From Swiss-Prot, chain D:
Protein name per UniProt: DNA-directed RNA polymerases I, II, and III subunit RPABC2
Segments for region (Leucine-zipper): 57-78
Keyword terms of this UniProt record: Cytoplasm, DNA-directed RNA polymerase, Nucleus, Phosphoprotein, Ribosome biogenesis, Transcription
Superkingdom as given in the UniProt entry: Eukaryota
Swiss-Prot record, chain H:
Subunit relationships: Component of the RNA polymerase I (Pol I) complex consisting of 14 subunits: RPA135, RPA190, RPC40, RPA14, RPB5, RPO26, RPA43, RPB8, RPA12, RPB10, RPC19, RPC10, RPA49 and RPA34. The complex is composed of a horseshoe-shaped core containing ten subunits (RPA135, RPA190, RPB5, RPO26, RPB8, RPB10, RPC10, RPA12, RPC19 and RPC40) where RPA135 and RPA190 form the DNA-binding cleft. Outside of the core, RPA14 and RPA43 form the stalk that mediates interactions with transcription initiation factors and newly synthesized RNA.
Post-translational modification: The N-terminus is blocked.
Subcellular location: Nucleus, Nucleolus
Stated name of the protein: DNA-directed RNA polymerase I subunit RPA14
Residues of the full protein shown: 12 to 100 of 137
Extra information: Present with 3100 molecules/cell in log phase SD medium.
Function: DNA-dependent RNA polymerases catalyze the transcription of DNA into RNA using the four ribonucleoside triphosphates as substrates. Component of RNA polymerase I (Pol I) which synthesizes ribosomal RNA precursors. RPA14 seems to play a role in the stability of subunits RPO26 and RPA43. In vitro, the RPA14-RPA43 subcomplex binds single-stranded RNA.
From Swiss-Prot, chain I:
Family: Belongs to the RNA polymerase beta chain family.
From-to range in the entire protein, with total length: 460 to 516 of 1203
Record localization: Nucleus, Nucleolus
Protein name (Swiss-Prot/TrEMBL): DNA-directed RNA polymerase I subunit RPA135
Misc. comment: Three distinct zinc-containing RNA polymerases are found in eukaryotic nuclei: polymerase I for the ribosomal RNA precursor, polymerase II for the mRNA precursor, and polymerase III for 5S and tRNA genes. Present with 14100 molecules/cell in log phase SD medium.
Known partners and oligomeric status: Component of the RNA polymerase I (Pol I) complex consisting of 14 subunits: RPA135, RPA190, RPC40, RPA14, RPB5, RPO26, RPA43, RPB8, RPA12, RPB10, RPC19, RPC10, RPA49 and RPA34. The complex is composed of a horseshoe-shaped core containing ten subunits (RPA135, RPA190, RPB5, RPO26, RPB8, RPB10, RPC10, RPA12, RPC19 and RPC40) where RPA135 and RPA190 form the DNA-binding cleft. Outside of the core, RPA14 and RPA43 form the stalk that mediates interactions with transcription initiation factors and newly synthesized RNA.
Signal peptide positions on this chain: none
Disulphide connectivity of cysteines: none
UniProtKB/Swiss-Prot annotation, chain J:
Positions bearing Phosphoserine: S20
Subunit-structure text: Component of the RNA polymerase I (Pol I) complex consisting of 14 subunits: RPA135, RPA190, RPC40, RPA14, RPB5, RPO26, RPA43, RPB8, RPA12, RPB10, RPC19, RPC10, RPA49 and RPA34. The complex is composed of a horseshoe-shaped core containing ten subunits (RPA135, RPA190, RPB5, RPO26, RPB8, RPB10, RPC10, RPA12, RPC19 and RPC40) where RPA135 and RPA190 form the DNA-binding cleft. Outside of the core, RPA14 and RPA43 form the stalk that mediates interactions with transcription initiation factors and newly synthesized RNA.
Protein name listed in UniProt: DNA-directed RNA polymerase I subunit RPA190
Superkingdom of origin: Eukaryota
Subcellular localization: Nucleus, Nucleolus
Function text: DNA-dependent RNA polymerases catalyze the transcription of DNA into RNA using the four ribonucleoside triphosphates as substrates. Component of RNA polymerase I (Pol I) which synthesizes ribosomal RNA precursors. Besides, RNA polymerase I has intrinsic RNA cleavage activity. RPA190 and RPA135 both contribute to the polymerase catalytic activity and together form the Pol I active center. In addition, subunit RPA12 contributes a catalytic zinc ribbon that is required for RNA cleavage by Pol I.
Species annotation: Saccharomyces cerevisiae (strain ATCC 204508 / S288c) (Baker's yeast)
Other notes: Present with 2840 molecules/cell in log phase SD medium.
Amino acid sequence: NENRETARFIKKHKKQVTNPIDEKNGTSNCIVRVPIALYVSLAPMYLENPLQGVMKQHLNPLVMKYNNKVGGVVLGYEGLKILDADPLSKEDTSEKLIKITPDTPFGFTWCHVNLYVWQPQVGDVLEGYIFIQSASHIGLLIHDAFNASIKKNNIPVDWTFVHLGHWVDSNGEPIDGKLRFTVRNVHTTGRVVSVDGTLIS
Amino acid sequence: DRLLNSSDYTQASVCRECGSILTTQQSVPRIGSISTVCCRRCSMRFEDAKKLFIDDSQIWEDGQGNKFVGGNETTTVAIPFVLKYLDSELSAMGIRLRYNVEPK
Amino acid sequence: MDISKPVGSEITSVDFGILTAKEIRNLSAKQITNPTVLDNLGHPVSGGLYDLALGAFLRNLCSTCGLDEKFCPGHQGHIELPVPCYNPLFFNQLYIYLRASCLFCHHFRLKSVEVHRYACKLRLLQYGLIDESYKLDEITLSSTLLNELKSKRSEYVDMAIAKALSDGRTTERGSFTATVNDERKKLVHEFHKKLLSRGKCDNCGMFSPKFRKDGFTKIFETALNEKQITNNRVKGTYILSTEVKNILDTVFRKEQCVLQYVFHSRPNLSRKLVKADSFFMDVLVVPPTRFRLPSKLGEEVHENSQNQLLSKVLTTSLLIRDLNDDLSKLQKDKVSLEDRRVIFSRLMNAFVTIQNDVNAFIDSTKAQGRTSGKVPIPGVKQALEKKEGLFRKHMMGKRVNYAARSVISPDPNIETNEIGVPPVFAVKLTYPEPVTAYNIAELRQAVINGPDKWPGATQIQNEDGSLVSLIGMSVEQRKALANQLLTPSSNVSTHTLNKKVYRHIKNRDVVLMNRQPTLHKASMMGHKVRVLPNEKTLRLHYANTGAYNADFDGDEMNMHFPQNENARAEALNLANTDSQYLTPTSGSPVRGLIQDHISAGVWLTSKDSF
Amino acid sequence: PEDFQQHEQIRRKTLKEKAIPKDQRATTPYMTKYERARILGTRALQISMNAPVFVDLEGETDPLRIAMKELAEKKIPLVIRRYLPDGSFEDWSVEELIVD
Amino acid sequence: MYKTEKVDLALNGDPITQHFGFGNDEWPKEWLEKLDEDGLPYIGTYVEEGDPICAYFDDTLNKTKIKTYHSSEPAYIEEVNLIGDESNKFQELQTVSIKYRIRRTPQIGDKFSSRHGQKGVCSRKWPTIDMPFSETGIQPDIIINPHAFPSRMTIGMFVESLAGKAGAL
Amino acid sequence: GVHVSYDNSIRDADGTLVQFMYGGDAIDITKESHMTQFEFCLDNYYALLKKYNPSALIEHLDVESALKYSKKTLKYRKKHSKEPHYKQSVKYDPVLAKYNPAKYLGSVSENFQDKLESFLDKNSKLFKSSDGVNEKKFRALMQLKYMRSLINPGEAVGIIASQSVGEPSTQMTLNTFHFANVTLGIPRLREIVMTASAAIKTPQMTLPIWNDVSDEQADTFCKSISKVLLSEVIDKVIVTETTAARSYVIHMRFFDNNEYSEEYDVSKEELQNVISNQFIHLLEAAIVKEIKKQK
Amino acid sequence: RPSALRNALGEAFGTKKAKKAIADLERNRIDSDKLTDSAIDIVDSVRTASKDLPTRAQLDEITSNDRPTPLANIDATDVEQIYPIESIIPKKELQFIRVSSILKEADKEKKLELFPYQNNSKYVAKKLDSLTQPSQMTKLQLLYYLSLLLGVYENRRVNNKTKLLERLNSPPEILVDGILSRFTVIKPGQFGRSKDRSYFIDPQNEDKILCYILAIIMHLDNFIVEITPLAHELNLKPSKVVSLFRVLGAIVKGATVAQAEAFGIPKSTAASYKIATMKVPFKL
Amino acid sequence: TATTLNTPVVIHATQLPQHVSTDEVLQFLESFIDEKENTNLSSSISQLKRIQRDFKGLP
Amino acid sequence: KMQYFLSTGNLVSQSGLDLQQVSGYTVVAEKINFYRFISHFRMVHRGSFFAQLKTTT
Amino acid sequence: TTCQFLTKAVLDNEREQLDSPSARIVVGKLNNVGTGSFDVLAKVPNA
DNA sequence: TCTCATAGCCCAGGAGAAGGAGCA
DNA sequence: TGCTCCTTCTCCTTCCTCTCGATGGCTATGAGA
RNA sequence: AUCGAGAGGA
Ligand SMILES: [Zn+2]
Ligand SMILES: [Zn+2]
Ligand SMILES: [Zn+2]
């Protein structure tokens, strides 16, 4: 069936939302809220504190951790609610009844929680401070949170490299504040994630 | 404990979107990040790739380095290893198997 | 097994299907058409049977995953056959569909309304309405009223299934039980009994020719009667596999509305339309090399038989491709010559052999043979059928770990529900005791004692799954581990787990004794441990001798040592001897006392016993 | 996104509308040997991998004996989910089963 | 128990360079505790699993490879046959036949039988101070089960016992 | 997959039902056989009362439904314990077939309750020596015991039944006291349950006779029912060929007429008619077949 | 004679008679001329499904195979140019191989300091004072590269670079990177390489490196190679080296009076003593 | 990491991602510090505070 | 070839030499004890084809 | 005769519901009869 | 210039199916 | 026109331990004396 | 280590 494959190519890899610039003045609103559901285990050694146990065993080890199914980096979780597998509970009860696998004391269950995901897409606007200086790239400081890489050939000839070296704006004064650049691709190369930056491409 | 757990108890990589345990494999850990198991049945070739756009999530390379795309819905189940043997032996007669794996 | 390694997912139900040729060309590892099996006496050739794309072969790496033999499962290749082959596993079934079709109109020689009625019957059987599947024949009275009757039957089946879908008599995935499947198989068997009797075509009066098979090998066609040829003309010998493919492809393309119903015992939810390539072998899969390794001892090599089969398949394939190149030589024109008469026949005879070779690959029985030696190398059918097959040799009957075997000996000094353990079995059978704060001092005692003095500690396993052995370490290397079982949370990824010890056996455990020819559930019972010094055998009480049918002239008892607290509780409660005092057959006991106790009871309770 | 929500609601439908009311639970109120053995083994497996303490340890090195001691006073927080050939399941807690 | 191990180094026309003894090479010195300098063991030596039996030098890896005793029981060396080729010594020594010897104490669990089919298993070797003693002074060698006689119907063991006591007097 | 479901009905593991109760009465064989010796249970009324304490279990179960229902069925099936079951216009179901047998106190089988009341009425001499033991207290004890002696939901009773047929079958293949008729031992048993064969080795039928029929009348019937072959009355067959083309004369010497007349109830004109009807016809057909099979 | 076997058959059996009569119904002619041209049309449909055969002459001989030889010049009829030195040694590495300080310095201590690998090789002492002409100095450089291959061969289990840099006398980087890029299985990944890189050599490339070593020794021994003293030197197996020279086209033969005249070895003890020689063509 | 003990198996969303502005995210920053009051993970807390100092005017 | 015949026992011929079974004509002497050793010269065998048949006649 | 019943199973496309004990051990799951006929579930606190 | 002397490889146990040999 | 009884094939199955072997033949190359 | 063949034990 030739009609299935075109949509399965273009729609499933197509993302959910696009970030607009606030009044064309600030930056994008790439910090977005999304409700998720998952299915995780729970240790008996934190059974007295089961919600914070689930937090410290699946969610607090998910802090600043990238997933492509969420598309970005989580800046914190909110609203942990366990979907109890026992009916007639009405979401106001304390005797939640989680299913136990018949080999281990780590009980798996469903949980809804919100995520605050940072995800950039193709053709977006971000900004960065002065973080490092080099001869052909400057890794920009993304929201004082991440690092941005710049390939050399995307730099026009109007930029003035001086010489350790430094980049000089077309205004001629040394740069300061938050420099604007365009997102082309997202990468995970390094200890944390990075981004592919551009200015004319 | 006896007839399964003490003889040939094994994990298994499954792609849930195809529902098989054999065609999945390990990707070559390239210079960017750690390796990740992937699905050869749910794989997009670089030959055509409906180009008569792919985001940098599912591009991975085999041992010679050909670019495949797909097969991320991966989970590990508990099987005997002789089940993997029987899966590889039933295809010799031309039989597909399909294993429903919840949580879907 | 590990109880510190929980499995999140699970197998819930099993579905079937058939892979086709282009899907294997999409997914599989590498096209392998190289008969080079031994490239200068010590090497795997690339693109051949031992290519590193198929995993790893005797301390080589992988050309697909690039990992070790203990990380790669081995990958599945694919032979591209020259011609499309049958699948023998389905063979006779499609042979029936070889003889039920009208060759001209591409329908079945039975009446079309009759096959429509069978299709509506099987559609009603898809949803558990056998009542409707016998009330369907109630709807009776050119082809205008025949189409009206077809629409009557269709509306009847649709309204019955809509009424079934009104209430919860059938869910969305369908209704299917034992009686449903029995009625379905009766109607499919009657259907195939009816699709072999109609000589003429019931659509246009034609005559399809007579066919006859060799069983797995060939199809022979017979010329029809002159009266039949006369009836065909006024109103209208070896055959190849591609002719069978083209005929059955056009039949399946014209008969989708009924063979969507015949070959599906449920509501086909994903709309899997049946095609001819579901029965056919244009490709063969190639197993991983890991499941095909020759047996090696030092230098001695027993080469696998499936390597011989698949190498003969590749050799025959390249011989057929070379004869295809010779036919490419003849097709310039070469028409004024009978020189291409022989090699073409040398094509066709070889065109037999590959079929035989596929009949020699999967089957080993039904084929031809180079006789007078009678050595059938195992096809994949014969590796699945018996006790020496797979379902009994490796699926059910498994030689286990952490077990023991001995001759036994009497002991009337321990109790009835107890077993005597010799020290030679008390050193080579361990229990995975975890680390917990109540039994921390006993485990430190076992760590100080070690693997040479009962009881003790042998293998301290860290939270990464990494092991630390004590089988050759010194005394002080053991004693320094005493303060090294209370490690805090170093890595938060594995912080919830603790350490483990494969400690020796002691009195607070339970084993499972068994005597190997069993006949009932009381031939295999749990027993509470007592370790005996200066002992060679297992020690038994006499009350067990009724249940195990034991005589002490050289018995052979097995002892499974269980590996979970769940199994400890089940052996201690659900299968202990205390709960097996009576037969489940009639109600008699099988336990008690034996002849010395009996004669002593005769003499002791007598009235001359002061 | 929305089809996942629909499948989620169908899952919660087939969970909820296959449940059994507390008025309908009419099995035996006893506890069979299988049920008691599974409760003991599973609770001891939890305690061996650090379940929270709710009974006195009495210096016993056997976790199965600690599980039987804890069963002796009905302290255990577990519920047996009894399944039926339909799949409609009742829930019998420890507090509403006659142990032995 | 007597066992036999045929250590050969000639399983593969000239190039066999595996030579018995020691080449000019380093090796852990405690092999002569169990061996001799000619690549052979001291005859009549305590052999336990984890000890070399035949050692030989080869220049193909500049290595003296050994042959470790692989059996469960502790053993002793009985006779070391040294076999040469039937033709006129075209190669040097290449085949060593070794006879192991293993002690077997009469143990518990052993199978002893009489001459009437009544086999059995020695369950415990009973102390002589715990034995029943006769008026003449002696204690028996083997106490046997008396209940085996009705079912098996071995009345001839009475006859052999009585005639043997008659011959013993 | 043949086990005890929670409704105490024998099903397969998918719900395919086989029986509605385990043996009809849900009594496990493991705790069975002390439902026949009631005098011993009266002798240990104190011990079985101290064991099965009804005080810590009355707070969870209804007690006064199955007792009344069982007394109604008891009065009805003592009222009509003489008609046959086809003439018995059937009333409502028996006791177990209504209630949960392990919830209501008094939900018992019919034969156990009948033998219980027969024991309680047969021993009127005995209970005068008792301390006050009646039908009621002893009945409540035996009903608590009957509730505690029911089978667990989830026992592998297909496996238990298979092993309890297999294990005494290994005491077999003995040529037993067979000649003083049917196939015996394992060759019978495997013929029954596994193979399901219609070609029985010795198929038989046992017909009861009335009381007015004497032994001579019944043996006259036995000589009436019996199958009679032609060769049973043939002494000599003499074929004399003479080759007029090829021909041959057949002379049959039979036996005396009174012999088979008394033994097989056959006259010589019945012999005439059976030579007339079936013998010469099949003989001629066999001659035609043997002539045709040369070519 | 098949008809005579059938004449014995028709009297002989009833099971083999039926079996071979079924085989004769199976035997009969499976091709006629109209069927021949119809099957020619069906082989044109096989052209339509022509999953093409591999070329089995250049992909299966020149590419990665059992023992990859050095880059051989079959077209060179000169036996000293079957392996030209610009084929074995790349020009990219050859342009920074300078041994003028080796023959310039007279101290053998500093000369063995300037070899990358140090051993008890008798071949180094045999072929250092023997070669006297500076015009063959690049051949001497070839011997240098031979010693450099020893720095790979008996030091291959060093599973990284810097600890393998601890086994050489700090050479220029291009030789070591050319060897580790042409001869090794490059396993990528910077997850561990920032700490410590880990990759090794598959045994097929190890036998390739053995072929390179034996070709370099084939240069410096008048293209007639010794076997048994080389088998003393290589510390490997004899028939292994015989196979490695049968891959490299060297005819490993016994000795005539010419090899007893040249190598100083006795002809009377040359029935088992082997010597590798060369001829013009390439192997099969 | 391949075990299920330290890794969730199924992760999906149910609704469209609503572009919450910096108001609710800043409120989550302040209430997140307050809830954690009521090292790589503390460096995650430090970067989560440098998000606030980033939007302020002096990081 | 005679070493093969005694070391394996497979009678390999063409006419079969007018017998029933085609294997198992060689017995290891087994001189563990002299009773066994003298029993292995009067120990006659009926036929492996009859050991195959389950009929107890 | 595993192959013939497997042929009929594929030509019926049998979704095996996985309730037979021998089937459940060939696949290798916790068997039904006994401590697998039900499930144990955890009673948890709120705080 | 042949004689060795070797490399390199080519007899249960019935039950079903399944279809001919006659019949309304 | 359609529907039965007489011949073939075509199918399938107690537990453990130890030892002892295990392709012929058609052609190249390759010295020895 | 696979297939045969042989032996022995409850
Ligand atoms: Zn997939
Ligand atoms: Zn791989
Ligand atoms: Zn037609």
